[PDB]
Design a protein around this ligand. Sequence first.
Ligand SMILES: *[C@@H]1O[C@H](CO)[C@@H](O[C@@H]2O[C@H](CO)[C@@H](O[C@@H]3O[C@H](CO[C@H]4O[C@H](CO)[C@@H](O)[C@H](O)[C@@H]4O)[C@@H](O)[C@H](O)[C@@H]3O)[C@H](O)[C@H]2NC(C)=O)[C@H](O)[C@H]1NC(C)=O
Ligand SMILES: *[C@@H]1O[C@H](CO)[C@@H](O[C@@H]2O[C@H](CO)[C@@H](O[C@@H]3O[C@H](CO[C@H]4O[C@H](CO)[C@@H](O)[C@H](O)[C@@H]4O)[C@@H](O)[C@H](O)[C@@H]3O)[C@H](O)[C@H]2NC(C)=O)[C@H](O)[C@H]1NC(C)=O
Ligand SMILES: *[C@@H]1O[C@H](CO)[C@@H](O[C@@H]2O[C@H](CO)[C@@H](O[C@@H]3O[C@H](CO[C@H]4O[C@H](CO)[C@@H](O)[C@H](O)[C@@H]4O)[C@@H](O)[C@H](O)[C@@H]3O)[C@H](O)[C@H]2NC(C)=O)[C@H](O)[C@H]1NC(C)=O
Ligand SMILES: CCOC[C@]12C[C@@H]3C[C@](C(=O)N[C@H]4CC[C@H](N)CC4)(C1)C[C@@](c1ccccc1)(C3)C2
Ligand SMILES: CCOC[C@]12C[C@@H]3C[C@](C(=O)N[C@H]4CC[C@H](N)CC4)(C1)C[C@@](c1ccccc1)(C3)C2
Ligand SMILES: CCOC[C@]12C[C@@H]3C[C@](C(=O)N[C@H]4CC[C@H](N)CC4)(C1)C[C@@](c1ccccc1)(C3)C2
Ligand SMILES: *[C@@H]1O[C@H](CO)[C@@H](O)[C@H](O)[C@H]1NC(C)=O
Ligand SMILES: *[C@@H]1O[C@H](CO)[C@@H](O)[C@H](O)[C@H]1NC(C)=O
Ligand SMILES: *[C@@H]1O[C@H](CO)[C@@H](O)[C@H](O)[C@H]1NC(C)=O
Ligand SMILES: *[C@@H]1O[C@H](CO)[C@@H](O)[C@H](O)[C@H]1NC(C)=O
Ligand SMILES: *[C@@H]1O[C@H](CO)[C@@H](O)[C@H](O)[C@H]1NC(C)=O
Ligand SMILES: *[C@@H]1O[C@H](CO)[C@@H](O)[C@H](O)[C@H]1NC(C)=O
Ligand SMILES: *[C@@H]1O[C@H](CO)[C@@H](O)[C@H](O)[C@H]1NC(C)=O
Ligand SMILES: *[C@@H]1O[C@H](CO)[C@@H](O)[C@H](O)[C@H]1NC(C)=O
Ligand SMILES: *[C@@H]1O[C@H](CO)[C@@H](O)[C@H](O)[C@H]1NC(C)=O
Ligand SMILES: *[C@@H]1O[C@H](CO)[C@@H](O)[C@H](O)[C@H]1NC(C)=O
Ligand SMILES: *[C@@H]1O[C@H](CO)[C@@H](O)[C@H](O)[C@H]1NC(C)=O
Ligand SMILES: *[C@@H]1O[C@H](CO)[C@@H](O)[C@H](O)[C@H]1NC(C)=O
Lengths: 121, 121, 121, 237, 237, 237
Amino acid sequence: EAIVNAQPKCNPNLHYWTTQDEGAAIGLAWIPYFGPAAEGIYIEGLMHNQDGLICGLRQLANETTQALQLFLRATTELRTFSILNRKAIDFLLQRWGGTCHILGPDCCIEPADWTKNITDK
Amino acid sequence: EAIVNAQPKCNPNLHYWTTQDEGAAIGLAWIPYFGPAAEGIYIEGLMHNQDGLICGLRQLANETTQALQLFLRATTELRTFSILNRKAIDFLLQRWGGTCHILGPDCCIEPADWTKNITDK
Amino acid sequence: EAIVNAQPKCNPNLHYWTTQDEGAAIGLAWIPYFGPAAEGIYIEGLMHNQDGLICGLRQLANETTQALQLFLRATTELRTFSILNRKAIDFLLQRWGGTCHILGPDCCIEPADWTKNITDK
Amino acid sequence: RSIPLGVIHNSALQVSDVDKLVCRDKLSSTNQLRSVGLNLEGNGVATDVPSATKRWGFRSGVPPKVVNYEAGEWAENCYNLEIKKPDGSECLPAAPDGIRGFPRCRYVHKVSGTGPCAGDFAFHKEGAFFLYDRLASTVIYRGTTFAEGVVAFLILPQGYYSTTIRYQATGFGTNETEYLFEVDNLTYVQLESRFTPQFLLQLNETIYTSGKRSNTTGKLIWKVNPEWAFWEXXXXX
Amino acid sequence: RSIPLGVIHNSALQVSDVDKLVCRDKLSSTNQLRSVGLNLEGNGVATDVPSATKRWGFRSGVPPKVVNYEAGEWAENCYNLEIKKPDGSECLPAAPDGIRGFPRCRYVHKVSGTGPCAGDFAFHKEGAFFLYDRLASTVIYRGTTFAEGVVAFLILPQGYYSTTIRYQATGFGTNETEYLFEVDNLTYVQLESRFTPQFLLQLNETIYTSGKRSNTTGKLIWKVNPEWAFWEXXXXX
Amino acid sequence: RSIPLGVIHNSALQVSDVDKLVCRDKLSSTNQLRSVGLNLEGNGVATDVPSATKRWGFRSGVPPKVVNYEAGEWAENCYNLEIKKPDGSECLPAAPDGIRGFPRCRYVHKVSGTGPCAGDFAFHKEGAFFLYDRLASTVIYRGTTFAEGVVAFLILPQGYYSTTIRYQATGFGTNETEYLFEVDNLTYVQLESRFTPQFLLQLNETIYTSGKRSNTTGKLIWKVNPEWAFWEXXXXX
Ligand SMILES: *[C@@H]1O[C@H](CO)[C@@H](O[C@@H]2O[C@H](CO)[C@@H](O[C@@H]3O[C@H](CO[C@H]4O[C@H](CO)[C@@H](O)[C@H](O)[C@@H]4O)[C@@H](O)[C@H](O)[C@@H]3O)[C@H](O)[C@H]2NC(C)=O)[C@H](O)[C@H]1NC(C)=O
Ligand SMILES: *[C@@H]1O[C@H](CO)[C@@H](O[C@@H]2O[C@H](CO)[C@@H](O[C@@H]3O[C@H](CO[C@H]4O[C@H](CO)[C@@H](O)[C@H](O)[C@@H]4O)[C@@H](O)[C@H](O)[C@@H]3O)[C@H](O)[C@H]2NC(C)=O)[C@H](O)[C@H]1NC(C)=O
Ligand SMILES: *[C@@H]1O[C@H](CO)[C@@H](O[C@@H]2O[C@H](CO)[C@@H](O[C@@H]3O[C@H](CO[C@H]4O[C@H](CO)[C@@H](O)[C@H](O)[C@@H]4O)[C@@H](O)[C@H](O)[C@@H]3O)[C@H](O)[C@H]2NC(C)=O)[C@H](O)[C@H]1NC(C)=O
Ligand SMILES: CCOC[C@]12C[C@@H]3C[C@](C(=O)N[C@H]4CC[C@H](N)CC4)(C1)C[C@@](c1ccccc1)(C3)C2
Ligand SMILES: CCOC[C@]12C[C@@H]3C[C@](C(=O)N[C@H]4CC[C@H](N)CC4)(C1)C[C@@](c1ccccc1)(C3)C2
Ligand SMILES: CCOC[C@]12C[C@@H]3C[C@](C(=O)N[C@H]4CC[C@H](N)CC4)(C1)C[C@@](c1ccccc1)(C3)C2
Ligand SMILES: *[C@@H]1O[C@H](CO)[C@@H](O)[C@H](O)[C@H]1NC(C)=O
Ligand SMILES: *[C@@H]1O[C@H](CO)[C@@H](O)[C@H](O)[C@H]1NC(C)=O
Ligand SMILES: *[C@@H]1O[C@H](CO)[C@@H](O)[C@H](O)[C@H]1NC(C)=O
Ligand SMILES: *[C@@H]1O[C@H](CO)[C@@H](O)[C@H](O)[C@H]1NC(C)=O
Ligand SMILES: *[C@@H]1O[C@H](CO)[C@@H](O)[C@H](O)[C@H]1NC(C)=O
Ligand SMILES: *[C@@H]1O[C@H](CO)[C@@H](O)[C@H](O)[C@H]1NC(C)=O
Ligand SMILES: *[C@@H]1O[C@H](CO)[C@@H](O)[C@H](O)[C@H]1NC(C)=O
Ligand SMILES: *[C@@H]1O[C@H](CO)[C@@H](O)[C@H](O)[C@H]1NC(C)=O
Ligand SMILES: *[C@@H]1O[C@H](CO)[C@@H](O)[C@H](O)[C@H]1NC(C)=O
Ligand SMILES: *[C@@H]1O[C@H](CO)[C@@H](O)[C@H](O)[C@H]1NC(C)=O
Ligand SMILES: *[C@@H]1O[C@H](CO)[C@@H](O)[C@H](O)[C@H]1NC(C)=O
Ligand SMILES: *[C@@H]1O[C@H](CO)[C@@H](O)[C@H](O)[C@H]1NC(C)=O
């Protein structure tokens, strides 16, 4: 389904913070003893509303809340870190969790080059 | 291997409780502040011994105990939630963790429709 | 890239300890109440520097430290157990996370037997 | 070998062979995998308090371990222990954060009293688990309702009433354990194995209505004259 | 249904349909998946302390839950609560190990004072989350800076200044809550909803420079005569 | 870049190139992946207590982090610290639940005493880890035996004796640290870097058998006159 922002207002600019795991460290700053404190591990960025993605994101997080709350009610885990990994697993199982029937709608195998390699013979 | 129930008795009816993550919530009950307490998050059901599955399940959990205990001895994790996800990963690796040789016994690719599409030409 | 040991010395013998999840238990020792204490759950082994693997391993763990520390700075998880599982997922996604173009460089499908089965017809 | 996984083939449940690969087996999402917990009750084990407690024991040197499970069975009998040493120190640890009691119990057998407790944790002598609210533990937590059970893992094919029964116990966890069933804080009945939960409730109601409760300040203890699975001093005769 | 996942198709964001399969969708590593958190601020909600606190409430029987998120938005308004009951017992729990405050706040509204706190935890009445440092919680922790927000999950396509504003509060979490803005430990201003953060700082600086702070040992309280989104006793007139 | 993964190609160990894909590489189960921990000992680092402690330092503002590892190396030298400030407050935190000591140590160097401890946690100044029982930490826990080491991740191809050595320390974690080797509670030897573990045990046995222990109520301290890897007051001369 498409994303319909239905909020009273939308800040179209997204001034964000995050971290990076593959930080190109300079010298010895990767060593915890010498590295930055907890407050200085962040990078920043600014993203505008091209393709209306910012307003879409705000609407997307709003609509995620119900499903996400019901998931957290049903888990016994105090802190959940596994959602994204589980979605990568479900991505693979949706495609490769059964026999892949070539040229079927639920099998992502392109046989074109092998079909053309057969035509040359 | 097949499941041989070898318990002194078997309750053939399974009156069970569980939760649901995709609960079709009515109104505002998905909000934690308004939702059910810890005691009321459960659904119930009743399953009979068709195909002898109930007695089989009791035997299955009995036979799982040894392997499961030895797994918990060897882990440092205080509470384990990752077993099922790891089994989904092992399911995929058993099938797609190497080169898939079409028409081999360890490759789940059905080339029939592409073989018939080649016959029409 | 290849592993270049650049340490002042290298112990070429690796006297190691670990656990086993599939321990062939004798009698009732898998039961926690009767099983070994925390100090006796370990197996031991000795591995020599054939193919220079031991010296290579020491160098490998040294070079892993920077990337691993930067990963732990960026996580909020107090104890991380998910690295290896996430690498198995990334292994599958690198190969099966898109459409598999047969006979392409990023598609691990061997069509030889199906190509020969087509030649016999 | 590894942890068995249950699957349905040929109208029967079986363990999946890891060494062999079945391409007809289809796993389309992680929702098709479930962990379930089944109650020892369902295998015919004696559930009276004297019999059940003889299956638990104290042990040191073994760290506790917890595994989660997603679905469980309604239990007829659960247990809840408050055991101290004779010096008044607690024998069982406080329930860790997030471990609540087993959610469906017809009868909760709450046992208080004393014992030697010659070990840091109480384990199941037969290797079974203590089942809590969607968490299975190898050890007993203090004052937390549990059912005895075991866990299974599966590939799926593609009102509530609870009644507490209170007991007092001396010498908990030994060869010579004494159990009393509590009517009020001063009236007790000498417990025996043959006394089912239903029979104890009737004994409690008849003692209350016939006036056989203690009408002094001291402790009154009755003994009862001698006069199948659940799903299928003084005297009194 | 299940937790929605955002993806970019046709120069627009959409929710991925689980029931349908798109082979043109490519996921090459777990690095392509991200969890993000967005601030209620960005949807136009009133952020003044009287309005924001009316969205939180105390509730028992519901265990708290935490989910992580990898990236967040710079907030204009965050909050930090130190609420006790009239008897002096704490209303909010200590921050668990590893939960630090929201990392980017222009104004931290620190609120101290009392209220009935008729519940074990404080939840968001509208279902939103309290955003901490890369952890989102369903409940408020004591003295820990948070922003109100909601979480999204995504498939990616293949200086800093902070200023604390202190308030005193009586009857926290009720229909009739009183708020005072703190100038010093003895000079307060009757808070109203219309007072933006910038206006309170100017009011503080003008009180300090005009000598309208209390020059006694007792409490001085001012009222201000009556004389758009952020990104777009006595008297005084 | 990302965390390197070791693999065997051409009879040699190498790091797997993420940017390139090798279909001949086969990963059939998660059992083929292992995390291992290797001891700094094995690279030739000085393991005497004066040298080893100079590699650790106190730091605030950095949250501790723990990663698990599945297999380890038998260590010749491990360490175990009980350090207080001069005021008697603890310098190191209690071991968290589930973190036990490193499981195989030939010599455990137990160090007690004082120091300034100008930081919330003790980290490894060279970026290495403190190895415990299958958990690797960035910080030192109190009274818990650890080995210095580093972690590797791998794709696999398809009796025990321990002896404690006790030291007293003043000014722990500084440029001018004093170390004493403990014979009994009243007899000490001025520690130097050159003293190997084997030499200290012989010094202890010779002091006991020659009667050079203190026969008073006061503290006796000896100095020893000046008269390769491990795998390959008064005086005394
Ligand atoms: C999975 O199911 C198995 C079968 O139902 C369970 O096996 C049980 O294992 C325990 C020990 O771990 C046994 O307890 C022992 O019993 C013997 C003898 O029992 C007494 O009764 C017999 C008649 O049944 C009598 O002939 C004897 O003289 C005994 O007086 C004792 O000597 C031992 O000390 C010990 O207590 C159970 O008997 C056994 N059950 C059965 C039906 O064989 C197994 O425990 C289950 N696993 C889990 C994790 O629950
Ligand atoms: C996702 O976005 C949704 C839309 O922005 C959010 O919906 C909000 O939901 C809450 C309840 O959960 C509503 O609060 C209620 O408001 C009504 C009426 O509001 C008053 O104002 C209107 C004019 O707007 C006026 O006509 C009325 O007379 C009211 O005085 C109250 O009666 C209720 O008691 C309750 O407070 C919000 O109004 C509503 N917002 C909008 C714009 O509709 C939703 O909360 C978001 N989800 C998350 C998780 O943040
Ligand atoms: C991975 O392996 C690397 C190589 O084995 C390790 O490199 C070590 O890195 C630390 C700093 O992080 C170095 O310590 C520094 O040493 C210099 C100079 O050392 C003194 O000795 C030299 C002779 O060796 C002498 O010429 C000098 O005058 C010095 O007196 C000091 O100035 C610094 O302050 C600092 O202490 C190690 O020297 C270095 N080892 C080697 C062999 O180069 C690296 O630490 C390993 N990573 C992990 C995580 O263990
Ligand atoms: C023989 C195969 O039985 C499967 C099962 C059949 C039913 C339902 C079942 C189950 O958990 N259903 C979920 C409902 C909510 C949905 N969101 C996801 C699926 C699954 C649990 C079960 C069971 C419960 C307790 C012990 C042993 C077993 C009784 C076993
Ligand atoms: C419309 C799709 O937006 C994607 C994104 C685009 C940017 C960057 C983005 C991001 O986390 N970048 C990472 C940087 C470090 C790298 N190591 C890994 C990728 C991703 C976060 C985001 C965002 C932030 C906060 C709230 C909502 C959104 C703003 C959303
Ligand atoms: C060069 C590749 O070495 C692989 C390895 C070869 C051996 C055994 C090995 C291992 O953990 N074996 C497991 C036994 C129990 C089974 N259930 C699963 C496999 C694996 C650990 C190792 C090692 C230990 C310590 C530090 C570095 C290394 C020494 C490295
Ligand atoms: C105590 O328990 C042991 C173990 O079974 C038993 O041999 C002994 O007879 C018991 N003693 C009494 C007095 O019951
Ligand atoms: C019985 O004793 C318990 C605990 O000792 C106490 O809480 C309860 O109030 C008592 N009941 C009566 C009727 O005194
Ligand atoms: C025993 O009987 C009395 C009287 O009806 C009742 O109040 C009490 O709850 C009963 N006890 C139990 C355990 O049912
Ligand atoms: C007093 O106690 C005795 C002994 O329990 C009992 O027989 C008698 O009926 C009681 N009288 C009452 C409850 O009035
Ligand atoms: C208290 O709150 C309730 C709930 O909205 C409201 O009906 C009532 O008027 C309030 N009382 C006062 C004095 O504000
Ligand atoms: C104001 O009060 C706070 C806490 O009550 C105290 O920490 C602070 O020092 C006080 N400030 C002055 C100037 O007295
Ligand atoms: C109020 O003004 C004084 C004087 O400049 C300043 O020291 C104080 O920090 C101000 N308070 C706030 C909250 O800005
Ligand atoms: C003393 O306090 C009064 C009332 O706040 C104020 O009008 C006056 O200016 C103050 N005098 C000073 C600060 O010298
Ligand atoms: C103290 O340590 C510093 C840092 O290396 C050094 O420069 C200084 O000489 C030391 N002082 C003494 C007295 O050892
Ligand atoms: C030496 O001191 C330690 C702790 O100060 C104490 O536990 C031990 O018993 C003492 N040994 C003797 C022989 O007094
Ligand atoms: C020192 O020697 C005595 C005498 O043999 C012995 O009891 C003691 O344990 C020794 N200390 C160490 C650290 O070996
Ligand atoms: C008494 O102590 C002195 C000094 O340590 C030593 O030389 C002498 O042998 C001791 N006498 C004994 C142990 O009998």
